[PDB]
Amino acid sequence: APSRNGMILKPHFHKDWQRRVATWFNQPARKIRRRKARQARARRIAPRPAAGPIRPIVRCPTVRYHTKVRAGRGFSLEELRVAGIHKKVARTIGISVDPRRRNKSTESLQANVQRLKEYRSKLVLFPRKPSAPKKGDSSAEELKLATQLTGPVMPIRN
Amino acid sequence: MKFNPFVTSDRSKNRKRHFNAPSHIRRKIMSSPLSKELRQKYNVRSMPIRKDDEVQVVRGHYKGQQIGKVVQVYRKKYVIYIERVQREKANGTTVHVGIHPSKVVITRLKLDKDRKKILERKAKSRQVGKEKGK
Amino acid sequence: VSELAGHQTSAESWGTGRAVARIPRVRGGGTHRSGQGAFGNMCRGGRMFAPTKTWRRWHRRVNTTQKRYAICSALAASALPALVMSKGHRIEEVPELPLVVEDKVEGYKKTKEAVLLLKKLKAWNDIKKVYASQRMRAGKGKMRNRRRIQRRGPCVIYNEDNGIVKAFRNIPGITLLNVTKLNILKLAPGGHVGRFCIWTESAFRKLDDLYGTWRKAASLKSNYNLPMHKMLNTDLSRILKSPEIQRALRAPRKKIHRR
RNA sequence: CGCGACCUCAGAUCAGACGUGGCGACCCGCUGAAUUUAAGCAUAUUAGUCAGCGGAGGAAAAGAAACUAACCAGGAUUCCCUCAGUAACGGCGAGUGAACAGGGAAGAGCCCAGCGCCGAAUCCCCGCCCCGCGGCGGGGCGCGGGAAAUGUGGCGUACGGAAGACCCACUCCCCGGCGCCGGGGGGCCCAAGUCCUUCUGAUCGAGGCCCAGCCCGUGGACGGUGUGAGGCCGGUAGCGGCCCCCGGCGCGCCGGGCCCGGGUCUUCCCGGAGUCGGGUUGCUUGGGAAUGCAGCCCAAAGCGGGUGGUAAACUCCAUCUAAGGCUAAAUACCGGCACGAGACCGAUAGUCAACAAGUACCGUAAGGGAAAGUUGAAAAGAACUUUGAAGAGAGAGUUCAAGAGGGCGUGAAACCGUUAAGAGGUAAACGGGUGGGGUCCGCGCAGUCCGCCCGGAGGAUUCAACCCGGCGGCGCGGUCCGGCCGUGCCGGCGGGGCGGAUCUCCCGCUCCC
RNA sequence: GCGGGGGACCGCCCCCCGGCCGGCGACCGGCCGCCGCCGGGCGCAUUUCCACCGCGGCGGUGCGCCGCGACCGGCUCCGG
RNA sequence: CGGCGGCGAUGUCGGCUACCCACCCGACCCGUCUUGAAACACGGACCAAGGAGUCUAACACGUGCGCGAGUCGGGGGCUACGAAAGCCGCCGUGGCGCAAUGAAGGUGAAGGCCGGCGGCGCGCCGCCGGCCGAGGUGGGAUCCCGAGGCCUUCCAGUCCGCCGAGGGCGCACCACCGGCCCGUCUCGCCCGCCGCGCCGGGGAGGUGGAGCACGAGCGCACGUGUUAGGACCCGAA
RNA sequence: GUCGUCCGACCUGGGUAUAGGGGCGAAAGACUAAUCGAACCAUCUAGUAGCUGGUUCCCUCCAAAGUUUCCCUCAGGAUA
RNA sequence: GCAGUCGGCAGAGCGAGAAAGAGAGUGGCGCGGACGCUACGCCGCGACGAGUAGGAGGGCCGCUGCGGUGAGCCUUGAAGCCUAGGGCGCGGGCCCGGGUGGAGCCGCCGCAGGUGCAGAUCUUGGUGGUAGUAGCAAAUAUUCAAACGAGAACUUUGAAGGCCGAAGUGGAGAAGGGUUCCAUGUGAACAGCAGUUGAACAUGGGUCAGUCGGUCCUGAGAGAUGGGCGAGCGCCGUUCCGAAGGGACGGGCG
RNA sequence: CAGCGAAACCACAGCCAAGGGAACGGGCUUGGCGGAAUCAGCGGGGAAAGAAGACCCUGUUGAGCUUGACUCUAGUCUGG
RNA sequence: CGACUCUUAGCGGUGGAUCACUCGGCUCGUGCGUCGAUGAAGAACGCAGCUAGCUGCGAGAAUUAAUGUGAAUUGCAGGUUGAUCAUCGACACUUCGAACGCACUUGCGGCCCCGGGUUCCUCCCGGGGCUACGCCUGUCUGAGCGUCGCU
Ligand SMILES: [Mg+2]
Ligand SMILES: [Mg+2]
Ligand SMILES: [Mg+2]
Ligand SMILES: [Mg+2]
Ligand SMILES: [Mg+2]
Ligand SMILES: [Mg+2]
Ligand SMILES: [Mg+2]
Ligand SMILES: [Mg+2]
Ligand SMILES: [Mg+2]
Ligand SMILES: [Mg+2]
Ligand SMILES: [Mg+2]
Ligand SMILES: [Mg+2]
Ligand SMILES: [Mg+2]
Ligand SMILES: [Mg+2]
Ligand SMILES: [Mg+2]
Ligand SMILES: [Mg+2]
Ligand SMILES: [Mg+2]
Ligand SMILES: [Mg+2]
Ligand SMILES: [Mg+2]
Ligand SMILES: [Mg+2]
Ligand SMILES: [Mg+2]
Ligand SMILES: [Mg+2]
Ligand SMILES: [Mg+2]
Ligand SMILES: [Mg+2]
Ligand SMILES: [Mg+2]
Ligand SMILES: [Mg+2]
Ligand SMILES: [Mg+2]
Ligand SMILES: [Mg+2]
Ligand SMILES: [Mg+2]
Ligand SMILES: [Mg+2]
Ligand SMILES: [Mg+2]
Ligand SMILES: [Mg+2]
Ligand SMILES: [Mg+2]
Ligand SMILES: [Mg+2]
Ligand SMILES: [Mg+2]
Ligand SMILES: [Mg+2]
Ligand SMILES: [Mg+2]
Ligand SMILES: [Mg+2]
Ligand SMILES: [Mg+2]
Ligand SMILES: [Mg+2]
Ligand SMILES: [Mg+2]
Ligand SMILES: [Mg+2]
Ligand SMILES: [Mg+2]
Ligand SMILES: [Mg+2]
Ligand SMILES: [Mg+2]
Ligand SMILES: [Mg+2]
Ligand SMILES: [Mg+2]
Ligand SMILES: [Mg+2]
Ligand SMILES: [Mg+2]
Ligand SMILES: [Mg+2]
Ligand SMILES: [Mg+2]
Ligand SMILES: [Mg+2]
Ligand SMILES: [Mg+2]
Ligand SMILES: [Mg+2]
Ligand SMILES: [Mg+2]
Ligand SMILES: [Mg+2]
Ligand SMILES: [Mg+2]
Ligand SMILES: [Mg+2]
Ligand SMILES: [Mg+2]
Ligand SMILES: [Mg+2]
Ligand SMILES: [Mg+2]
Ligand SMILES: [Mg+2]
Ligand SMILES: [Mg+2]
Ligand SMILES: [Mg+2]
Ligand SMILES: [Mg+2]
Ligand SMILES: [Mg+2]
Ligand SMILES: [Mg+2]
Ligand SMILES: [Mg+2]
Ligand SMILES: [Mg+2]
Ligand SMILES: [Mg+2]
Ligand SMILES: [Mg+2]
Ligand SMILES: [Mg+2]
Ligand SMILES: [Mg+2]
Ligand SMILES: [Mg+2]
Ligand SMILES: [Mg+2]
Ligand SMILES: [Mg+2]
Ligand SMILES: [Mg+2]
Ligand SMILES: [Mg+2]
Ligand SMILES: [Mg+2]
């Protein structure tokens, strides 16, 4: 029964909710395990950056967010084509690839192309056989000054 | 303070592990300190006791400077029996009373080759600690 | 408690008739547990009233400004000699209460250097009081892994750990804290302000960047400044007997007019 | 007729393998209620829930768009926060109820069929030899047998692909064996008081340990030991030690494989059907003129099809490319193996189960299902004497204690026996008020000190005042000397950090000869 | 032209100074003065300080228990 | 009271209470439902131990704390007790708040004075400029000014403090009147241009709104109340 | 004790068949393991109850209602 | 009402019917003085005090556990429990003395709750009165002597008197029970008195088959494969939508 | 009588008359009065025990059965 | 007075509360994440010098071997060149059970081989190895008025 002036409430507790209650007492355990998996990954890919491959600049859709740019899934094949990077060697030198993504405008295409050309300028590539350097591989000075990068690779700013 | 997350400090777990310990772990629990002269001779503080150590009782009713050999190491009630450490029943027969080896000072070991091997191992690990500290 | 506790029987009430009290009772069998009062908080066996669930709200979030407020207030109280003595720390011979020892002692390794440092800083009497307060706890905490209780000695607060934690951690009552990670639970134990603190020098100097002055915000926090005093002169006696108030007071009526 | 192909179908204790069944906390596929709520009840809700059935794995399922969107567009799946108790559904009542965008955790993609070309270039099995031989694999020889043209393998898959011609450009990936160099299990160990007194049944208690303020302390977690232990013992701490074992990780050798690309132009090629879609029926959904699924009927097309949350026609546009397949991580885990912990419970509690507990016992059966911890420090568990047929006593003995005697720590109350005292025909009991008697208590029983002054004898190297030294408190001592501090300010031939939606010489990058 | 670097400006903060002002009672030193206390001297008993005595006085508090009286004041009930 | 008395060591003093007994007066057995219980209403032979408004979520209001036109890291990440605590700001995504109204398309919270010009017939009915500018009335805690005055032989004569007729600014708040915003209705004249349109904007008067009219919210904690959950505990056919 | 029947629709053992909205019934709603106008076991399930019963320490302060209106309302709510 | 304890830096006022200043300037010896004030405290006046349902406040009331604290208590005796002892508080309750007990416990500030019992035909356990009461009465019946034995109404033996009366109170089997069968010992517990006895308890023993039964057969029926159905575990079906014969004599050949 | 030895039930209990009272008291008021502990009987009383009235009514509680109740459905008839 | 009854105290019984202990739970979290026709899960029956239960084990039966360990086990007996414990990788592992020759009685077979028997010629007895369903690849024997070809 209702009393005087108050809200009409509809609590969704008419099912047997107490079997499927998910407590979070393993929250710092999940956080601590995710942290150790992150440092294990970072230790495994030792000079490659810890967060992962480079992600492109994408405009969010759906007018609430279309002023904001963010990181997309991968560089699109025409962006790699204009940057002159093979779409199978991109994922080997650390470039995210999205085959599914179209371009509709020139400027986002060119901004991600310049991002690719800004990333290959920073890329220090170790030779494939360690006692024999090859044609496009980085020189022994940037090999000795290679470090593991933290955070997103060249993070995206508004 | 213990920091190892695999070693328990739970009272009931420690008590269960102590009172259900198998006999070769019981031997290590039933360990007696050596004498001051035996400490300066072998550089060993503590040793598991055997069926032939000449020992002294230093705590209890049967304490004193008298020396008796261990005659039985009764691992199931965690006690040992020493020679003149006895009491008489109603009927006049003497029985041996149980003494815990922590209240027992060893003044003469049964030196077996196993015992000498254990004594050398304990002395060497103690000296590794002493020469690691500096 | 387990949610199956006391509900692991089949039990029907006998209904009316039978001259018994209408509670559910155990079915059949030749044993003691037969017609013997199964469900309900009032029976032997059976679940308790309102069985405790795991999803009680165990955890309480406090606002970040209030958590820094309490750290500020506990630190501020740990510099007044009356409040720490009312907390019971034996400081009647320490040479200054915000007791800052120089930064060499963060590089300690052995416990004997720590003990000699406390003895020469006259804070060893607090550890001796902690030793005197070592005793067994009254009650079921002894059977619940909390056999021994003891009071708190000082809190050594440091900037960088060059072995001071291992050199001090075997002395009872001493809590080690980094200035970047100051704990209100360890800086006001029991909710009572007045914990004795022994600072190191760089630890002491980083306080004006961790929490700020009033003119400058906190350099090591995002947006935090020191809280503001609701009154600035708290010397009520000095306020009241100052001439400005006394010229405006009326004459006091100090005379007892009984019946 | 007979012989031989092939196809289809049998038989075999033919040769070699594989499945069944269990567990089931988590997961997948079906099937699927009613109690309940609506203050009745039938749609609804409960609930795609319980029960039932099938199938797994260490995760499963899902998963690389026949997608979201309408934006300046995003970009597999899964999970978290928010979206949001919202859009929407609903006897529009009760109630139910998502999705996209956004921020994160994680992050990885790929393969067929089809279309094409390559002397089927492909696969399986038996025989011999050599190796390796406890995951049955590698090399070679078989005018050895089958499979397969009713299509195996190589290239190749919608992000396009292939071939030819022209250019540009390197010879290093991986398999099978093998030896050589520098995390995991298990075992054994590693500091310091039994120091001097003293309490005690026993001390681990209490006091002391000087001029090293007993000793160690990277160890003062815990447990055991006759109360209570950092130092008696096991342990604890430590980038502490040693010995095996199993890996992972590098280099080296033999044999075998693979003898491979990017760009430009030209010429060709390109797709999954009783499936989509329509009607209807039934279930399902927030999906409302039908979200998904399924039955039945109809039944496709290729500048086509699907979607674009209101049925339909015309016309633009956008977005994918269905009817084939694989895929870790984040995610889940009340079963299991091994652990750790606790502001939990403390034997009518906490699991049914602290103990010979899913036991004893009950029911034909499916099933149901208890009660029950504690002598003591140590059995030292009462020898011997005596009564009695004996149980049971009386002595004696052990123990600190039997006032702890083998269902024995503590030993309450109900109830009972006995002793003591008091009482007694309106059942007892009670409230108020006294009185009497007991039990003890007040260790009551010639009763209080305190301050000042007077007197009396007594004692004291003793008061005031002055000298020295130390300590403390208090005119800025108007305007004594110097410092420090200001949620004070002004000045600057000042020397710096931080911030700002305040303005304006070099480098990278993009068109332009 | 883009993005980034450089510079200037502005604000706030920190540190050198030069100057007022305030506080040192959440925060001082030095000397000078006054006081108080402690110690050591000198002082030496009509002073001072101890302990006893009187059934001492003064002022406070209570009497061991059982009692009684006196007046004062308040409230009452009466009576002459 | 600056008044007295008596009794005391093995039989007496005190002990309101506490054990028993005696007597007078009072006095029916509790719990419960009920207009009404001592009831010929039900439960209760006795004793011990157990035994019933909890927790989660939401909302409301009140109160406490912090910050405040903002607030909040709860999810994620970085660095024995500690599974804690500290930090992140180019982790404020996001929630709630700062804006409402309409079914929706949608729209969305003061205006007046001056200089210039019966077009009409904004003297009325727009735009060029400047200025002033967020309403008023009544009450209203506080506060402000002050005709005069608060004595010590008596006239002055100054400063400070206090009191004060009367007059003021008026907090919060209340009541009323205007004003502004969205829906809708009625009347009526204009203003705009890239497209002069079945276009767009404006005014006056009412009226519907959970609005504005110089914020008050957010987070946390506590308390009560109402619910959804086994829901204070036991109970069906 | 007295009774019905006691060569026939007779009595009886063992084996077998039918199982819960089902069986079986010379029919009484009888029987179906002391259970039958729907057996027994476990679960859904701590099913719901406007209806009975109970609901645990002290002191202090304040202190009611059985009336209005609406309700498949009359042993109950909402509202004042 | 009280911060006014405003002291040789002194001057000790502010109850008094009547708005305000115990205001300030300048001209005309002996070293003294109760208490107070946990300001959440203390003090003073006046009025008042019923209470169900219900609401609120204060609890130096109580339980358990946690965080602080008491240089706390404790084997020269903790908790618990008993008490004709002493007391305190309006009360919840608490403190102390005695005794028992034999190892832990409590005060204060906060925190948390599975936190206070006379009831619920409450749950579990224990104990009363009833009460040495009801009762040990269905089927005719026992008596004498002896033995053993600590002990005899009841065991055994003898004698007597009786009953079942061949549809038995006899001799044997089925099913079922499972060692109850047999011998010896015991008399604690049980056999509703007893017991020297037992189907009790404890020690040892005991069941021998070609022909006796099972085994084999088929009955009423149960039930696979085939087949069919079924989401499925599976179900129907039993000669039915089956290539259902693995057998034998003779002949030939090795 | 010897041996053995329960259970139901129980607020406290147990002599009456009248009164009032929840309209038939063992208790209360007013009277009558009242004397240990007991045995065998007995059936007036304890509105005696036995079992949360089965009759009646209420509940927005059911179930068995019926039909011209409401809404469905197996089967069956008929069409495509 | 006594007996009986009531009350209180002391002592003693009955009873097992309270308290103090706690090799047990409950809850949370971490790591691993493994059964079976080579016979699992489960069940039955046995196994110790005295052994009923529990536990351990399987006719090698409270355990065998190997390694680590290093002198016990213990309720009573008896008897370091390795006792006892732990680890467990070697070996073994009765009957049933998916349970597997057919059945469920401990019933009945069949094939092959070995030993007694025989004098392999059968019998008989003992022992060993096989004998279930479905299904895959392959092999062999075949079936068909299925489709052909050849003579
Ligand atoms: Mg209400
Ligand atoms: Mg990451
Ligand atoms: Mg329980
Ligand atoms: Mg306690
Ligand atoms: Mg085969
Ligand atoms: Mg309903
Ligand atoms: Mg209802
Ligand atoms: Mg109903
Ligand atoms: Mg549903
Ligand atoms: Mg299920
Ligand atoms: Mg399976
Ligand atoms: Mg598995
Ligand atoms: Mg998949
Ligand atoms: Mg998505
Ligand atoms: Mg919301
Ligand atoms: Mg639903
Ligand atoms: Mg999204
Ligand atoms: Mg091909
Ligand atoms: Mg291929
Ligand atoms: Mg694709
Ligand atoms: Mg000591
Ligand atoms: Mg210890
Ligand atoms: Mg100990
Ligand atoms: Mg010590
Ligand atoms: Mg040691
Ligand atoms: Mg050690
Ligand atoms: Mg270690
Ligand atoms: Mg539905
Ligand atoms: Mg369209
Ligand atoms: Mg549409
Ligand atoms: Mg495809
Ligand atoms: Mg696909
Ligand atoms: Mg128990
Ligand atoms: Mg207990
Ligand atoms: Mg239990
Ligand atoms: Mg006991
Ligand atoms: Mg004792
Ligand atoms: Mg005892
Ligand atoms: Mg006892
Ligand atoms: Mg007497
Ligand atoms: Mg009377
Ligand atoms: Mg009632
Ligand atoms: Mg009535
Ligand atoms: Mg009553
Ligand atoms: Mg009556
Ligand atoms: Mg009733
Ligand atoms: Mg009753
Ligand atoms: Mg209780
Ligand atoms: Mg609030
Ligand atoms: Mg932890
Ligand atoms: Mg409300
Ligand atoms: Mg309930
Ligand atoms: Mg509730
Ligand atoms: Mg129920
Ligand atoms: Mg019949
Ligand atoms: Mg009838
Ligand atoms: Mg009702
Ligand atoms: Mg009622
Ligand atoms: Mg009152
Ligand atoms: Mg003990
Ligand atoms: Mg609790
Ligand atoms: Mg009770
Ligand atoms: Mg009789
Ligand atoms: Mg008998
Ligand atoms: Mg016999
Ligand atoms: Mg014969
Ligand atoms: Mg069948
Ligand atoms: Mg008799
Ligand atoms: Mg009566
Ligand atoms: Mg009376
Ligand atoms: Mg009668
Ligand atoms: Mg009734
Ligand atoms: Mg009834
Ligand atoms: Mg009704
Ligand atoms: Mg019905
Ligand atoms: Mg007990
Ligand atoms: Mg061996
Ligand atoms: Mg060995
Ligand atoms: Mg048979």
PDB file of C-alpha atoms in Angstrom, chain C residues 69-173:
ATOM      1  CA  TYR C  69      40.844  16.187   5.119  1.00  0.00           C
ATOM      2  CA  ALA C  70      41.262  13.466   7.732  1.00  0.00           C
ATOM      3  CA  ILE C  71      44.898  12.929   6.786  1.00  0.00           C
ATOM      4  CA  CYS C  72      45.422  16.696   7.166  1.00  0.00           C
ATOM      5  CA  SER C  73      43.675  16.769  10.549  1.00  0.00           C
ATOM      6  CA  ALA C  74      45.508  13.722  11.939  1.00  0.00           C
ATOM      7  CA  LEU C  75      48.872  15.108  10.810  1.00  0.00           C
ATOM      8  CA  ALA C  76      48.002  18.490  12.342  1.00  0.00           C
ATOM      9  CA  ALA C  77      47.078  16.808  15.618  1.00  0.00           C
ATOM     10  CA  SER C  78      50.271  14.725  15.617  1.00  0.00           C
ATOM     11  CA  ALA C  79      52.290  17.929  16.202  1.00  0.00           C
ATOM     12  CA  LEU C  80      50.590  19.132  19.412  1.00  0.00           C
ATOM     13  CA  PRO C  81      52.140  17.615  22.573  1.00  0.00           C
ATOM     14  CA  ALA C  82      48.911  17.422  24.575  1.00  0.00           C
ATOM     15  CA  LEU C  83      47.084  15.310  21.982  1.00  0.00           C
ATOM     16  CA  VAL C  84      49.817  12.693  21.520  1.00  0.00           C
ATOM     17  CA  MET C  85      50.303  12.381  25.294  1.00  0.00           C
ATOM     18  CA  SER C  86      46.534  11.984  25.571  1.00  0.00           C
ATOM     19  CA  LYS C  87      46.963   9.234  23.011  1.00  0.00           C
ATOM     20  CA  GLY C  88      49.448   7.846  25.518  1.00  0.00           C
ATOM     21  CA  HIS C  89      52.741   7.917  23.648  1.00  0.00           C
ATOM     22  CA  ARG C  90      55.650   8.386  26.042  1.00  0.00           C
ATOM     23  CA  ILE C  91      57.215  11.540  24.659  1.00  0.00           C
ATOM     24  CA  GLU C  92      58.156  13.424  27.845  1.00  0.00           C
ATOM     25  CA  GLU C  93      61.848  13.575  26.821  1.00  0.00           C
ATOM     26  CA  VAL C  94      61.710  13.844  23.010  1.00  0.00           C
ATOM     27  CA  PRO C  95      63.442  17.081  21.994  1.00  0.00           C
ATOM     28  CA  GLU C  96      60.772  18.315  19.560  1.00  0.00           C
ATOM     29  CA  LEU C  97      57.419  16.803  18.772  1.00  0.00           C
ATOM     30  CA  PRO C  98      57.452  16.994  14.938  1.00  0.00           C
ATOM     31  CA  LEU C  99      60.453  14.775  15.436  1.00  0.00           C
ATOM     32  CA  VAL C 100      62.468  14.868  12.240  1.00  0.00           C
ATOM     33  CA  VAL C 101      65.621  12.774  12.151  1.00  0.00           C
ATOM     34  CA  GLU C 102      67.954  13.387   9.236  1.00  0.00           C
ATOM     35  CA  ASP C 103      67.867  11.361   6.038  1.00  0.00           C
ATOM     36  CA  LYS C 104      70.805   9.024   6.841  1.00  0.00           C
ATOM     37  CA  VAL C 105      68.539   6.663   8.789  1.00  0.00           C
ATOM     38  CA  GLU C 106      66.561   5.643   5.701  1.00  0.00           C
ATOM     39  CA  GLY C 107      69.643   3.702   4.600  1.00  0.00           C
ATOM     40  CA  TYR C 108      69.622   1.494   7.700  1.00  0.00           C
ATOM     41  CA  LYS C 109      69.974  -2.249   7.313  1.00  0.00           C
ATOM     42  CA  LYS C 110      70.111  -3.918  10.739  1.00  0.00           C
ATOM     43  CA  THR C 111      67.647  -3.705  13.616  1.00  0.00           C
ATOM     44  CA  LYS C 112      70.304  -2.737  16.181  1.00  0.00           C
ATOM     45  CA  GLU C 113      70.945   0.589  14.431  1.00  0.00           C
ATOM     46  CA  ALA C 114      67.181   1.216  14.548  1.00  0.00           C
ATOM     47  CA  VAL C 115      66.994   0.424  18.274  1.00  0.00           C
ATOM     48  CA  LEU C 116      70.009   2.641  19.022  1.00  0.00           C
ATOM     49  CA  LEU C 117      68.417   5.426  16.948  1.00  0.00           C
ATOM     50  CA  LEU C 118      65.196   5.237  18.959  1.00  0.00           C
ATOM     51  CA  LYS C 119      67.130   5.122  22.246  1.00  0.00           C
ATOM     52  CA  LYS C 120      69.127   8.214  21.313  1.00  0.00           C
ATOM     53  CA  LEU C 121      65.989   9.987  20.066  1.00  0.00           C
ATOM     54  CA  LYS C 122      64.422   9.094  23.459  1.00  0.00           C
ATOM     55  CA  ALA C 123      61.503   7.314  21.790  1.00  0.00           C
ATOM     56  CA  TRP C 124      62.487   3.884  23.124  1.00  0.00           C
ATOM     57  CA  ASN C 125      60.262   4.332  26.176  1.00  0.00           C
ATOM     58  CA  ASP C 126      57.282   4.058  23.826  1.00  0.00           C
ATOM     59  CA  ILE C 127      58.506   0.652  22.592  1.00  0.00           C
ATOM     60  CA  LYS C 128      59.033  -0.327  26.231  1.00  0.00           C
ATOM     61  CA  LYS C 129      55.410   0.642  26.921  1.00  0.00           C
ATOM     62  CA  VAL C 130      54.410  -1.500  23.902  1.00  0.00           C
ATOM     63  CA  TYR C 131      56.397  -4.397  25.416  1.00  0.00           C
ATOM     64  CA  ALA C 132      54.590  -3.850  28.705  1.00  0.00           C
ATOM     65  CA  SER C 133      51.273  -3.878  26.846  1.00  0.00           C
ATOM     66  CA  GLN C 134      51.923  -7.233  25.171  1.00  0.00           C
ATOM     67  CA  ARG C 135      49.300  -9.674  26.502  1.00  0.00           C
ATOM     68  CA  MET C 136      46.715 -12.167  25.326  1.00  0.00           C
ATOM     69  CA  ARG C 137      43.405 -10.889  23.985  1.00  0.00           C
ATOM     70  CA  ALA C 138      40.229 -11.626  25.917  1.00  0.00           C
ATOM     71  CA  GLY C 139      37.758 -13.768  24.032  1.00  0.00           C
ATOM     72  CA  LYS C 140      37.258 -15.811  20.877  1.00  0.00           C
ATOM     73  CA  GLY C 141      39.840 -13.789  18.961  1.00  0.00           C
ATOM     74  CA  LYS C 142      42.408 -16.191  20.411  1.00  0.00           C
ATOM     75  CA  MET C 143      40.631 -19.040  18.632  1.00  0.00           C
ATOM     76  CA  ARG C 144      40.322 -16.758  15.568  1.00  0.00           C
ATOM     77  CA  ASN C 145      44.057 -16.170  14.883  1.00  0.00           C
ATOM     78  CA  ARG C 146      44.207 -12.999  17.017  1.00  0.00           C
ATOM     79  CA  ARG C 147      45.733 -14.366  20.206  1.00  0.00           C
ATOM     80  CA  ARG C 148      48.067 -11.497  21.097  1.00  0.00           C
ATOM     81  CA  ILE C 149      47.280  -7.785  21.358  1.00  0.00           C
ATOM     82  CA  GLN C 150      49.690  -4.950  22.105  1.00  0.00           C
ATOM     83  CA  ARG C 151      49.657  -1.187  21.940  1.00  0.00           C
ATOM     84  CA  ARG C 152      51.132   1.093  19.289  1.00  0.00           C
ATOM     85  CA  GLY C 153      54.505   2.690  19.316  1.00  0.00           C
ATOM     86  CA  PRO C 154      55.644   5.332  16.861  1.00  0.00           C
ATOM     87  CA  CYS C 155      55.068   5.664  13.145  1.00  0.00           C
ATOM     88  CA  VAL C 156      58.304   6.137  11.221  1.00  0.00           C
ATOM     89  CA  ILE C 157      57.453   8.124   8.098  1.00  0.00           C
ATOM     90  CA  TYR C 158      59.986   8.014   5.269  1.00  0.00           C
ATOM     91  CA  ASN C 159      60.461   9.186   1.694  1.00  0.00           C
ATOM     92  CA  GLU C 160      62.572   6.498   0.008  1.00  0.00           C
ATOM     93  CA  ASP C 161      63.099   2.975   1.318  1.00  0.00           C
ATOM     94  CA  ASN C 162      66.784   2.068   1.440  1.00  0.00           C
ATOM     95  CA  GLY C 163      66.251  -0.734   3.961  1.00  0.00           C
ATOM     96  CA  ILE C 164      64.603   1.256   6.771  1.00  0.00           C
ATOM     97  CA  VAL C 165      61.460  -0.908   6.563  1.00  0.00           C
ATOM     98  CA  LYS C 166      63.427  -4.120   7.135  1.00  0.00           C
ATOM     99  CA  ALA C 167      65.625  -2.439   9.740  1.00  0.00           C
ATOM    100  CA  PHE C 168      62.607  -1.266  11.739  1.00  0.00           C
ATOM    101  CA  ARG C 169      59.917  -3.868  11.088  1.00  0.00           C
ATOM    102  CA  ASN C 170      60.908  -6.325  13.844  1.00  0.00           C
ATOM    103  CA  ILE C 171      60.474  -3.713  16.582  1.00  0.00           C
ATOM    104  CA  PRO C 172      56.929  -4.068  17.969  1.00  0.00           C
ATOM    105  CA  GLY C 173      54.513  -1.178  17.697  1.00  0.00           C
TER     106      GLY C 173
END
